[PDB]
Amino acid sequence: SELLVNTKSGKVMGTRVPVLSSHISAFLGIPFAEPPVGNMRFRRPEPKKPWSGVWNASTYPNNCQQYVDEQFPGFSGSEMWNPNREMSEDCLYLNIWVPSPRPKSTTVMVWIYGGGFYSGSSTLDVYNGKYLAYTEEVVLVSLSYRVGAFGFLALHGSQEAPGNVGLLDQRMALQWVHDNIQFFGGDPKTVTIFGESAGGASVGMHILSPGSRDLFRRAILQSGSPNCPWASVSVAEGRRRAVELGRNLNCNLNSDEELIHCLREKKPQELIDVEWNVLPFDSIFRFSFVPVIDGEFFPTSLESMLNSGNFKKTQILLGVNKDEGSFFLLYGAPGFSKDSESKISREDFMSGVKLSVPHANDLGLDAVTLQYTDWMDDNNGIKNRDGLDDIVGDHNVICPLMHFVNKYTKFGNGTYLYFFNHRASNLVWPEWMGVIHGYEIEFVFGLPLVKELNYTAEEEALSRRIMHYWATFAKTGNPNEPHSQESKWPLFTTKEQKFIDLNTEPMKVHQRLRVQMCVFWNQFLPKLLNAT
Amino acid sequence: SELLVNTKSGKVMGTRVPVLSSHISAFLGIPFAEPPVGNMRFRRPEPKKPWSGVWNASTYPNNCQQYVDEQFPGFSGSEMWNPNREMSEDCLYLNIWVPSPRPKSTTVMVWIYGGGFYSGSSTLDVYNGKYLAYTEEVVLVSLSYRVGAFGFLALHGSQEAPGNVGLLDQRMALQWVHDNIQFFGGDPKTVTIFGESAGGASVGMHILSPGSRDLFRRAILQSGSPNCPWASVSVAEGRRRAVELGRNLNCNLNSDEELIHCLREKKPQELIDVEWNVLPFDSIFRFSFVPVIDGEFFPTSLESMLNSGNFKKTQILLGVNKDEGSFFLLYGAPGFSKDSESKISREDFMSGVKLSVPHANDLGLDAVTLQYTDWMDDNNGIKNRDGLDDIVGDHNVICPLMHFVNKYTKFGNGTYLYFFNHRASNLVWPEWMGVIHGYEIEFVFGLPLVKELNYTAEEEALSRRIMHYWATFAKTGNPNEPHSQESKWPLFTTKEQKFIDLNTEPMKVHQRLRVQMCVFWNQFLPKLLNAT
Numbered sequence A, B: 001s002e003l004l005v006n007t008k009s010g011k012v013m014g015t016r017v018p019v020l021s022s023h024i025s026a027f028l029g030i031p032f033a034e035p036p037v038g039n040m041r042f043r044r045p046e047p048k049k050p051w052s053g054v055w056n057a058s059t060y061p062n063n064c065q066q067y068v069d070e071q072f073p074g075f076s077g078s079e080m081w082n083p084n085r086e087m088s089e090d091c092l093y094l095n096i097w098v099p100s101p102r103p104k105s106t107t108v109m110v111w112i113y114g115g116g117f118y119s120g121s122s123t124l125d126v127y128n129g130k131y132l133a134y135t136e137e138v139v140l141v142s143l144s145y146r147v148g149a150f151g152f153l154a155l156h157g158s159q160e161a162p163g164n165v166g167l168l169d170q171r172m173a174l175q176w177v178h179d180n181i182q183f184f185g186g187d188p189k190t191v192t193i194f195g196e197s198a199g200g201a202s203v204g205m206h207i208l209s210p211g212s213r214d215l216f217r218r219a220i221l222q223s224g225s226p227n228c229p230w231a232s233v234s235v236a237e238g239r240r241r242a243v244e245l246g247r248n249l250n251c252n253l254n255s256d257e258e259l260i261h262c263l264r265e266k267k268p269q270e271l272i273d274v275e276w277n278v279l280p281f282d283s284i285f286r287f288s289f290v291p292v293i294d295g296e297f298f299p300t301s302l303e304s305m306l307n308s309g310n311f312k313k314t315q316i317l318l319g320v321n322k323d324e325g326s327f328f329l330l331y332g333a334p335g336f337s338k339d340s341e342s343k344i345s346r347e348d349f350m351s352g353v354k355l356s357v358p359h360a361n362d363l364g365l366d367a368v369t370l371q372y373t374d375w376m377d378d379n380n381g382i383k384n385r386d387g388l389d390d391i392v393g394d395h396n397v398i399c400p401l402m403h404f405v406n407k408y409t410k411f412g413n414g415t416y417l418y419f420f421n422h423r424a425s426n427l428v429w430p431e432w433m434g435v436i437h438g439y440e441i442e443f444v445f446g447l448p449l450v451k452e453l454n455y456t457a458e459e460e461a462l463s464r465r466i467m468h469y470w471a472t473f474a475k476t477g478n479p480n481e482p483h484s485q486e487s488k489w490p491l492f493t494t495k496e497q498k499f500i501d502l503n504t505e506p507m508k509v510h511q512r513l514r515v516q517m518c519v520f521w522n523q524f525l526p527k528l529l530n531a532t
C-alpha cells in the first residue's frame, strides 16, 4: 500500500488526505534529527538514530519553543502565524505531501518558514502543501528548525553553543531529503528550496555556505535575503547578547562553560521571557538571536563572498511584496494602530525615521528624511505614513534583496524577479498596511482554490498562475512553459534588469525595481556614514 | 522750455525723443562723480564738481572699461550685451527719461545693470527706458558703475583701493537722484531701485548696507541676490586675487602702496587681458573682482545680517527665470555648443557636476548627482542636459534668492514673488537654453511694444502686464491696481509662500518655489560639507 514507505532510517506510515475533490498522501512529523533536549540544548543537531517498527506519520508534530504574539488575542490576522501545536524542544521534524498514485521520480520542493529567526511553524494552515503537491504534481516538503536562543545562541569558540545551529537544523533536513526522498517518489536531483522572510534569508544563506550548496538544485527567495540587516550579527555582537542573556537570568558569567550550564538549566519559557531584553538600545526592527558570521558556516563576510562569486551558481526566482514595512511599524512604531488609518504627524515621521536607521549620525537622518519627504506637502498625514512605510521596507527588505539580485546575477545561471502587489480581497488587517509582508504565501500554496476561504475568482486564477510559475521553475529552472504562448516572464539580466508584476491584471514587464531608493540605501547612505 | 533743467550741480539740456507715435524728454550722460581716472583709479568716487554753462545731455555717455564677449562675432544674441559706445575710465554717468509735459512729482525708477560685476552698460538697446517712462508715466533713471578690477579691486586696510568702489559708484548715483530728481519732475520720496543678475545682487546689497538704506524707498531684484555664491568674496580672497593680478603684470608686490602704483600705471586693457587668470583653479562659474565683505559697506557677514533683521525694512518684488544655468554651461562647460542640441553623456554630466560645485568633497558630488539623476533613464542625453542646467541655476541663482526671500519676509513690509517662464518668440539662442537668464528684461522695458522688433501680440500684452506690475509696485508698493478686478498677485507670506507665473497664459498662483531642490542646496548640502 502507498501509505507505507521504507527509508534509510525506518518505516513510516502516512494518511490519505482529501484535497479539492480528490485525495493524496501525507507523511506528517517525520524526525530528521535527535531531539535537541537537555545537555544537547544549543548544540549542533545529531542525525536521527534509526528506529524499529512503523513510525505513525499521520499527525502534525510539535512546533519549536518560541515567542507567541498576543498583541491581538483572537485576531485571526495575527494568530494564523502563531504555533497551532504544543510547543517543545523536541521539534526537529519534516512533513511530506506525495501525489497519488505515488510518482517514481518527480521534482521536490522544500519549504523553509520565516519569522525573523525568533518564531515560526511548519504546521500553519497557510503552509499546508497538499494543494501544491496535488495541483502541480510535486513532492512538497516542509522542514522545521530551532528559533530564538535555542537555535541561534552564539558563543563563538565554544562547541556546546557555537551559533547557527538552527541553520544546521535546516541543513540536516535537506540532507535527509537528499538521502530518502527517492523512496517517496521524489527526484533528489531536482530539489528546490524556497522560503519567505527569514526563510528567504535562509535559502540565500544555503546558496552561500559551502557545506550546504550540494544538497539542493535551485532556490526561491520571497521577501528575504541573506544580506538583510536583521538577518545576521557579528561574532562579537552574538557573544554580547549571549552574556547579556545570562545577566537577565542570574547566570554565572565567568566562562562559556558556566554561562551555558546555567542557560541549559532554565525552563524554555524563562529564556523566552527575557529574550527581547538583550537587544541594544538601538531598538526596534531587529531580533535577538539570528545567524552569526562565524567563519565556519560563512567563510568570510557576506559582502566579500557576494563580490567574489563565492557561492553556488544555479537558477534563482525571487521577489518582494509592495509594502514590506507595515508590520514593523504597527507593532513597534509610535502612532500606528491596527484600528486607525494611522496618519502620522511631521513629528512622528521624524521619530520613526530615527527608529528605522539604528545608530545613524544626525546627518544621515536628514539624508533619509530629505529623500522620503515631499516638501510641497510636508504635513500630509497619509504621505508621512506611506513614506515611513517605504523607508522601513526599502531598508530592511527590498533594497537588500535588490543588492543580492544584482550581485548574484553576474555569476548565476538564470535570475527571475517579481514584484507582488495584489492585496487579497479577504485581508483582515487594515487597508493602510497595503500589500503586506507575508500575504503572497497563501497564493503560492493555492489557498484561493478553496471556495469556503472567500477569495475572488481572479484570486484563484492568480494563485494558479503563481503555483505554476513556482513549480515549472522548480522542474526546469524556467517559470515559463516551453511552447505555451502566453506572455513570457523575461530573464533578469544585468543590462536590462527586467521584472514582472504579480497581480490579477495581465502581466506587465518593468525595469530597475525601486532603483532610485536603493541607490540611496545601497550606495549613498553607507558612504555618508563611513566618512563622518 | 522743458529740455532745460537746473540742478544743484549745473544746467543740463536734453533732447526730444520719439516713442510709439509720441514724444518724451531724455537727458543722456549726466555726470554724477568726478572721472575716476589716473591716481584716482581704484579709489572711492568723489562727487562731480559743479559746472558753469549748459551740459549737452543729448547723447549717450561712454561705457566703462570691461571685458568684451567675442565668442560669437556678429551674433546679435551675444552682442546686444556688449558695449555699444567707446569705452573709458571716465564713465560715471546716469541717464533720465522724463515724460512730456514734465511731471511735478511722479515716481522714480533707477535701473542697475548686471554682468557679473565684470561687464555691463547703461546704454544697451534693451535698457532704453523711453518705453517705460512714457507708458507708465514714471521718471526712469539708469546709472553706471565701475566693473572689473577698476570697480572691485580689494586690498583691505588700504584707502587707495579698499574694494566695493563700484558699489559706492551706484550709491553716489542714488544720492544724486535723491538731491536733484525733484527738478526733473521726480518724487525723491518714491524711488524704486531695480536691476537684474549682478544688478539684482546690488539692489539687495543696498538693502543691506546702512550707508545706502536711506537713499531709496523700495526695491526689485531680477535673477539676482546679495547672497549669491558668485556675488561676494572674503577680504582674504580679495587680497589674494589682487596680488595674483600683480604677479600677472610684473608688479612689485612687497607693499599695498607699491602693488597699487604698478596697477595704476598699466593701460586698462592690460588689466582686462589677465583678469581671468586670478581665479582659483576652482573654476568656472565665478568672476574675478566682485564685492567684498569688508566690515565697512557690509557690517558683518551677509548671513548674520539676514538672520538678525539687520537690513532696510520695506516692500520688495523679485523673481527668477525658468532656466538660469544656460549661459554658464554654454560658455564654460564641455559638451555644450550654441549650434547643437547639446545632449550630454553620463560622463560629461559627471564632469559638469564637479564644475558646478567648486571645492566639494566627493561625498558632496554624489549627493548632487543622486539628487538630479533619474536612475530609471540615466543615459538620456536630454535629461542629462536639463539636469545639469537645473543644477547650475538652482545653485547660483534660484536657491540663493529663495533663501533671501524667506529670510527677508520675516521682517519686511511686503514681498511679491514671480517665476518668469515665457521663452520669447524671436529668441536667437538655441531652443535647448530655454527661458534664458536675462530675457525677461526686454519685457520689463516694453520692447514687445515695437512691432518692427517682431514680437507676437501676446508678447505685447505680457510686456504691458509686466510694466504695469513694476510701475504700480514702484508707486504704491503693491503690483495690483486697487479696485481693478483682474486676478490678484498675492502677497508672499512665510506661511503660504505663494508666487505667480509670468507668461502669456492667464496668471496662475503656486506655492513653495523649487522647495525640494532648495532644501537640498540651502540646508542639506552645506551641512554635509561642514561635517566631513
Ligand SMILES: ONCc1nc(CCCCNc2c3c(nc4ccc(Cl)cc24)CCCC3)ccc1O
Binding pocket: A069, A276, A277, A279, A283, A284, A285, A286, A328, A331, A332, A333
Ligand atoms: O516591534 N516592537 C515590538 C514590541 N513589542 C512589545 C510587546 C511585548 C513583547 C516585546 N517583544 C518584541 C517584538 C518584536 N520586536 C521587538 C523589538 C524590540 C524589543 Cl525590546 C522587543 C520586541 C516584533 C515581534 C513581536 C514581539 C513591546 C515593545 C516592542 O518594541
Ligand SMILES: ONCc1nc(CCCCNc2c3c(nc4ccc(Cl)cc24)CCCC3)ccc1O
Binding pocket: B069, B276, B277, B279, B283, B284, B285, B286, B328, B331, B332, B333
Ligand atoms: O565660463 N567659462 C568661460 C571661458 N571663456 C574662455 C574664452 C576667453 C576668455 C576667458 N574668460 C572667462 C569668461 C567667463 N568665465 C570665465 C571663468 C573662468 C575663466 Cl579662467 C575665464 C572665464 C564668463 C563670461 C565671458 C568670459 C576661456 C575659458 C573659459 O572658461
Ligand SMILES: *[C@@H]1O[C@H](CO)[C@@H](O)[C@H](O)[C@H]1NC(C)=O
Binding pocket: A056, A058, A059
Ligand atoms: C497514531 O496512529 C494510530 C493508529 O496507527 C492512531 O489511532 C493514533 O490516533 C495516532 N496518534 C495519535 C496521537 O492520535
Ligand SMILES: *[C@@H]1O[C@H](CO)[C@@H](O)[C@H](O)[C@H]1NC(C)=O
Binding pocket: A412, A413, A414, A415
Ligand atoms: C547556464 O549554463 C549553461 C552551461 O553551463 C549555459 O550554456 C547557459 O547559457 C547558462 N544560462 C545562463 C542564463 O547563464
Ligand SMILES: *[C@@H]1O[C@H](CO)[C@@H](O)[C@H](O)[C@H]1NC(C)=O
Binding pocket: A452, A453, A454
Ligand atoms: C465568508 O464570508 C462570510 C460573510 O461575511 C463570513 O461570515 C464567513 O465567516 C466567511 N468564511 C470564512 C471561512 O472566513
Ligand SMILES: *[C@@H]1O[C@H](CO)[C@@H](O)[C@H](O)[C@H]1NC(C)=O
Binding pocket: B056, B058, B059
Ligand atoms: C552736443 O550739442 C550740440 C548742440 O548743442 C550738438 O550739435 C552736438 O552734436 C552734441 N554733441 C555731439 C558729440 O554730437
Ligand SMILES: *[C@@H]1O[C@H](CO)[C@@H](O)[C@H](O)[C@H]1NC(C)=O
Binding pocket: B412, B413, B414, B415
Ligand atoms: C507694513 O507696515 C505697516 C505699518 O508699519 C503695517 O500696518 C502693515 O500691515 C505692514 N504690512 C506688511 C505686509 O507687513
Ligand SMILES: *[C@@H]1O[C@H](CO)[C@@H](O)[C@H](O)[C@H]1NC(C)=O
Binding pocket: B452, B453, B454
Ligand atoms: C523680422 O522678421 C524678418 C523675417 O525673417 C527678418 O528678415 C527681419 O530682419 C526681422 N526684423 C528684425 C528687426 O529682426
Ligand SMILES: [Cl-]
Binding pocket: A102, A103, A104, A182, A183, A184, A185
Ligand atoms: Cl517508489
Ligand SMILES: [Cl-]
Binding pocket: A264, A265, A266, A267, A268
Ligand atoms: Cl529544562
Ligand SMILES: [Cl-]
Binding pocket: A402, A403, A406, A522
Ligand atoms: Cl547594489
Ligand SMILES: [Cl-]
Binding pocket: A421, A422, A423, A503, A504, A505
Ligand atoms: Cl491587482
Ligand SMILES: [Cl-]
Binding pocket: A386, A431, A432, A433, A434
Ligand atoms: Cl498603502
Ligand SMILES: [Cl-]
Binding pocket: A515
Ligand atoms: Cl542599478
Ligand SMILES: [Cl-]
Binding pocket: B102, B103, B104, B182, B183, B184, B185
Ligand atoms: Cl519742475
Ligand SMILES: [Cl-]
Binding pocket: B264, B265, B266, B267, B268
Ligand atoms: Cl593709464
